[PDB]
Structure formats: C-alpha cells, structure tokens
Design a protein around this nucleic acid. Structure first.
Ligand SMILES: OC[C@H]1O[C@@](CO)(O[C@H]2O[C@H](CO)[C@@H](O)[C@H](O)[C@H]2O)[C@@H](O)[C@@H]1O
Ligand SMILES: OC[C@H]1O[C@@](CO)(O[C@H]2O[C@H](CO)[C@@H](O)[C@H](O)[C@H]2O)[C@@H](O)[C@@H]1O
Ligand SMILES: OC[C@H]1O[C@@](CO)(O[C@H]2O[C@H](CO)[C@@H](O)[C@H](O)[C@H]2O)[C@@H](O)[C@@H]1O
Ligand code: MG
Length: 580
DNA sequence: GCGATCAGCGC
DNA sequence: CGTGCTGATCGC
C-alpha cells in the first residue's frame, strides 16, 4: 500500500529539523549543470516532497541545506552537491552517504541505487531507479504522483537503513573509513569535478587537422599494399586481408575470429610492409577518434572546460574511476599521443599546472605489508627497483644489468603490482608460460618475505572469506574455494593484489584530504583538478609554485607512516604536457 | 537503438 | 586468463 507523505506547496519549519534523510534527485547520468527533478525530506516530523522551483528559491531551505549543523543522510551526496553547486547553492552537513556505506561493505554487490543497497538488509519497500525512469531512449521522468512517491520511498529507506549500515561498518571496523576518509573525499571530488579542467580547443583542432592528414596518407598506403580498399577499423575485414589474401600466419585467434591486436601485428611485421602501416594507422586513429574528437565532444562551449565525474563507488580495489571524459588515461608513453596533454591548460591567466606522483607506491606498500627485508632495504636506499630486481633474479652485479634484463625485471614488477597470471606475464614478455613462471620463482627466492605474504594472505582469504587494506577496505573472494584451478587461481592473485593496490588507493585518498586541509590553512589559491591513481594534478598561480614544490610532496609522503619511506616526484609547467 | 566483440589507453 | 573507460564495427 502507498506510503504516506505531504506533497508540500511551500517549505515549513518541521521540514528543517536538524536530522533528516534528504533526496535531491538528478536523473541525468551526467549531473553537471543538470536538472533537479524533485526533492524529498524524511525526518522525525514526517515525510515530505518539495518541487525544486519552490524549495531551491526558498531562503530558509537554502540556508538549511548549507547549515553544517543540520545533519543529512543521503545516497550519492556528491551527485546532489555538484548539481547544487551549478545552481550556486552549497550543501553541507551530510553525515551519512548510503552509496558509500554500501560500497565499503561490499564493492562486489555493484550497488548503484537505493533499492540495491536496501536489498542488502532485506528492505524492499522501494523501487529500483531503472524501474521508475526506464533506460536508454525510453528514459524519462514520470508524472509527479509517481515521482513523488519514489523520492519519498528512497528517502524513507535511507532514514531506516542508516543505523544498520553504520552498525555493520562498525563491526567491520570500517566506520572511520566511511566517516573520516570516503565521505570527506566525496566533497573534495565534488569541488574538483565542478572546477573542471580548461582545454585549448584550438590546439586540439589543429592536431586533429594534422592527424587527418597523416591518416589519409597511411590509409591509401594500406589499400595500396593490400591491393584493394576495405574497412581497416574492422578486425573482421582486416583479418581476411591479412590472413587470407596476404596469407600471413595465424598466431592467435579470438573467440569469433582472427586476432589483430597490436601484440600479434608486432610479430607479423617482418612478413609484410602492410603490417607496420596498420600499426601506424591504429595509433593515429586511436588519438584522432578517442583523444581529439572524443574530448572535443564533451568540452563546454562557454567555458572551454571538461568536467569529469569520478565514480567513487565502483572498483573492487578502492580506486576511483573517471568518465565523460575519462581523464585518467590521457596518452603519455608515446611522444605522439603525449602531445595531447598540451591541450590541457590552467583555467586562469598566469597560473600553472602542478603534478605530483608517488614513486613506486605499490611496491613500497608491498615491502611494508610483507615486511620483506630485501625489498624494504631496497626502498630505504631508494634504489632503482627494476635494476635491483634484475640484479637479484638474474644474480648479477649492478653494472652487469643489461637493458633487456631491466626490461624483463620491470615486466615482472608490473605483474606483481597488478596481480597478473604467469600467462599474462608470458604474453607481455613474449615468452612461454613455463619461462614466465620461472621468473616468478626466482623472484620469490630473492624476496622470501613476499612469498610468505602471498601464501599467508591466500590462507587468510580462505579462512575469513575476504582480504583487507591498510585502512580496512574489504574485498570478499568467494572463488578462493573453487575446485576450478583457473577460477581459484585468479581469486588467489586478487587476494595478494587487493591489499597492495587497495592500500595505495587508501593512501592517496587520505593525502588528498590532508592536502586540501593544508592548502586552506595556508590560504593558497592552488586547487586539485585530477587524481590519476598514484598522482595528483593541481593548478595554481605561478607565484605559488615554489611553496607547492615543498608542500605537496610532503603532505603526500606523510599521509601514512610505513616501514619504508614514501617518495613523491613533482613537476609543473604551462600545460599538463609541460608538467614533466 | 542497443548489446556483443575487439581494440588500446594509463594506472 | 589485472583493471575501467571509450570508440568503431556488426548483427539483431
Ligand atoms: O553519480 C555517480 C554515481 O552514480 C552511479 C549510480 O548510483 O553511477 C551512475 O552515474 C555515473 C556518472 O555519470 C555513470 O558512469 C554510471 O553509468 C551511472 O549508473 C554510481 O556508480 C556512481 O558512484
Ligand atoms: O571513406 C570512408 C569509407 O571507407 C571505408 C573503407 O572502404 O572505411 C575507411 O574510413 C573509415 C572512416 O575514416 C574508417 O573507420 C575505416 O577504418 C577506413 O578503412 C568505408 O567503411 C567507409 O564508408
Ligand atoms: O602448495 C601449497 C601452495 O599452493 C597454493 C597455490 O599456489 O595453494 C594451494 O594449497 C593450499 C593448501 O596449503 C590451499 O589452501 C589452496 O586452496 C591451494 O590452491 C599456495 O597458496 C600455497 O602456498
Ligand atoms: Mg609514478
């Protein structure tokens, strides 16, 4: 039966109590400068629905929203906070965010709406958002009666669920993680997203023109060498040309056909001149379609800024993700793509971009957690970790390490940092699974502490059912007991990797909170723009660079205290590209 | 229109 | 046989 509530035509005092579940509904997935379709408030006085036009124009309600002493419980408060920021309204006092609470309790559940979170506690008196709004082209805000009941039911669920969610977090020893880390970070992410990053669109357009030129040249060359025209961007069509018309060997196949991935094309290059051209085409095409045209599509015409959205409740490792646009994967490895970064500039005249990154934070975290004497000593001496790993696994002095040895040691470390299988390592180094496994073995012989940790963490995951990070983030691994070798092995690798990657996530998140506190104490105009897993990107007046060179690295390095030092490198320049 | 498949970017 | 995200193609 329907849920009782007052569909108010004006704001009343009882709607402004010092404790309430609040819903400020933004239906558009991208909430930047998006519409607020409705508001719901549930407190000790009852349940209320308010039309945005009314509430947001009412000075009492606005003041209530901005009053830090008036506590609010919400679901995805960042969405509401940002939508309100675009309307010039401040949201304060959010003491509980159900989305973040559910995320910390179990990232694997994929909770993306109130209904999903509520179902965790057998509460189902609320509908999934998709059921109410639909999806895709059929998505739309329903009539007021339907909308009002939905927002009220969501607010009611939040009101009822706060206590049980907080109680379980306390049992998991995650209450501080929510209240002292994720919730405060949510507000910082809101400011970053709202600020956005300025884009030199003319620069991007110029690069695009140039790429279009090169693409046309290589495209014709490809048809030339192929003896016919075909859709190069079609793995299917390309596969027929390469493996049927040109008879190149089939070294790898996909579930549906011939593989044409770069790793495969690399091996085929010697056989035909068309290959190198296909590779060149893939590189330029990726830049053109994804980084030039893609970025240009989401830049705001009025300010020339891009406003990403950081998904704080998605990854199972505790990392943040970025969308519309994704600003965590802008090219940097190859010089060609790297130039894309020249397009990201300061948002004000005479300001500069400042970037600071942790040096090998994942392996330092591993040295700390595993308490491996060799690895800890390596970082205490601040050694080149890849040269050092090569020295130990290949049993040679430092001057005996060749470039190829270091490359292979670096690939092994990559595998450790990301928890890839011996198969993954074999493909990465183009060697046999046996040889790959062989390197792993040599690594454990030289880093016995790491081997002990891996064995111990796997047993711990099996016994408790989950693994944890430095700040108590948790990840359940039900597959660790599977009688299927591949499935179980993956779970075991995640058991060892999550504490590493997840703790690194915990650290940079706390650094972000500590940094903003310091920037405020110092009254610096500098502010965060982006987080890219192990690095922070800021912009600030050129006159603040010297102070940032000392402040940023220090705050980041001191975020937590490990058995080994943390080290942060930094650079600044006129564009993101120049902050190298 | 929309999901599946394949590709490649940085972490 | 680490991952999330985005874009081009392809078949229903
Ligand atoms: O507001 C971000 C927050 O919303 C969720 C759903 O609760 O994701 C939605 O919004 C994202 C940003 O536009 C989209 O990428 C995603 O597809 C959409 O469902 C959460 O996952 C996220 O933390
Ligand atoms: O000129 C466009 C026309 O060419 C084809 C090949 O016959 O595709 C080419 O151009 C596309 C757009 O630039 C690329 O995506 C593709 O990789 C390239 O081969 C046709 O599909 C298209 O109609
Ligand atoms: O030989 C023991 C060694 O094998 C691993 C897998 O690499 O774990 C296996 O053996 C354990 C018993 O000691 C089981 O609990 C586990 O499920 C099974 O895969 C290592 O963790 C262990 O050191
Ligand atoms: Mg780094």
């Amino acid at each position: 039966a329907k849920m009782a509530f007052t569909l108010a035509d004006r704001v009343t005092e009882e709607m402004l109590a010092d404790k309430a579940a609040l819903v400020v509904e933004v239906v558009e997935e991208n909430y930047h400068d998006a519409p607020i379709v409705g508001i719901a408030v549930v407190n000790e006085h009852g349940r209320f629905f308010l039309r945005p036009e009314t509430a947001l124009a009412d000075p009492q309600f606005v003041a209530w929203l901005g009053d830090e002493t008036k506590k609010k419980s919400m679901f995805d408060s960042k969405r509401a906070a940002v939508a309100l920021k675009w309307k010039g309204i401040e949201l304060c006092g959010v003491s509980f965010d159900l989305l973040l609470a559910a995320y910390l309790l179990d990232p694997a559940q994929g909770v993306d709406d109130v209904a999903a979170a509520a179902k965790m506690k057998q509460y189902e008196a609320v509908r999934p958002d998709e059921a109410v709004y639909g999806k895709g082209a059929k998505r739309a805000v329903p009539d007021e009666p339907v909308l009002a009941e939905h927002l009220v039911r969501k607010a009611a669920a939040i009101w009822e669920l706060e206590r049980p969610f907080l109680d379980e977090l306390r049992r998991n020893e995650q209450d501080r993680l929510l209240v002292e880390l994720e919730q405060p970070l949510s507000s910082i992410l809101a400011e970053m997203e709202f600020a956005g990053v300025k884009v030199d669109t003319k620069r991007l357009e110029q690069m695009g023109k140039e790429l279009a030129e090169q693409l046309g040249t290589v495209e014709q060359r490809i048809y030339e060498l192929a003896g016919q025209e075909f859709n190069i961007n079609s793995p299917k069509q390309l596969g027929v040309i390469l493996f049927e018309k040109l008879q190149l060997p089939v070294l790898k196949k996909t579930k549906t056909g011939y593989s044409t991935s770069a790793d495969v094309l690399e091996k085929l290059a010697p056989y035909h001149e068309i290959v190198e051209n296909i590779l060149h085409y893939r590189q330029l095409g990726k830049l053109q379609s994804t980084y030039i045209e893609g970025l240009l599509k989401v830049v705001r015409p009025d300010t020339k800024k891009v406003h990403t959205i950081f998904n704080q409740a998605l990854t199972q490792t505790g990392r943040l993700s970025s969308t519309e646009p994704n600003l965590q994967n802008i090219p940097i490895r190859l010089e060609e793509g790297r130039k894309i970064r020249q397009a990201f500039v300061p948002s004000e005249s005479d300001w500069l971009i400042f970037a600071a990154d942790y040096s090998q934070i994942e392996l330092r975290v591993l040295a700390h957690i595993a308490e491996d004497d060799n690895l800890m000593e390596a970082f205490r001496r601040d050694l080149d970790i890849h040269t050092k790993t090569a020295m130990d696994i290949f049993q040679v002095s430092e001057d005996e390490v060749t470039p190829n040895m270091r490359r292979q040691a670096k690939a092994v470390n990559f595998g450790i940092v990301y928890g890839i299988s011996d198969y993954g390592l074999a493909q990465n180094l183009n060697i046999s699974r046996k040889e790959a496994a062989e390197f792993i073995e040599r690594y454990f012989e030289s880093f016995p502490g790491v081997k002990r940790y891996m064995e111990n963490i796997v047993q711990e995951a099996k016994q408790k059912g989950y693994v944890t990070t430095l700040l108590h983030r948790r990840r359940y691994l039900p597959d660790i007991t599977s009688r299927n070798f591949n499935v179980r092995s993956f779970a075991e690798r995640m058991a060892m990797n999550t504490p590493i990657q997840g703790s690194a996530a915990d650290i940079i998140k706390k650094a972000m909170i500590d940094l903003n506190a310091r920037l405020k104490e110092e009254r610096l105009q500098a502010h965060l723009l982006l987080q890219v897993h192990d690095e922070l990107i800021l912009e600030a007046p050129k006159e603040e660079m010297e102070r940032l060179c000392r402040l940023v690295p220090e705050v980041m390095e001191q975020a937590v205290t490990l058995r080994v030092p943390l080290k942060v490198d930094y650079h600044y320049g006129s564009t993101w590209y120049d902050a190298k």
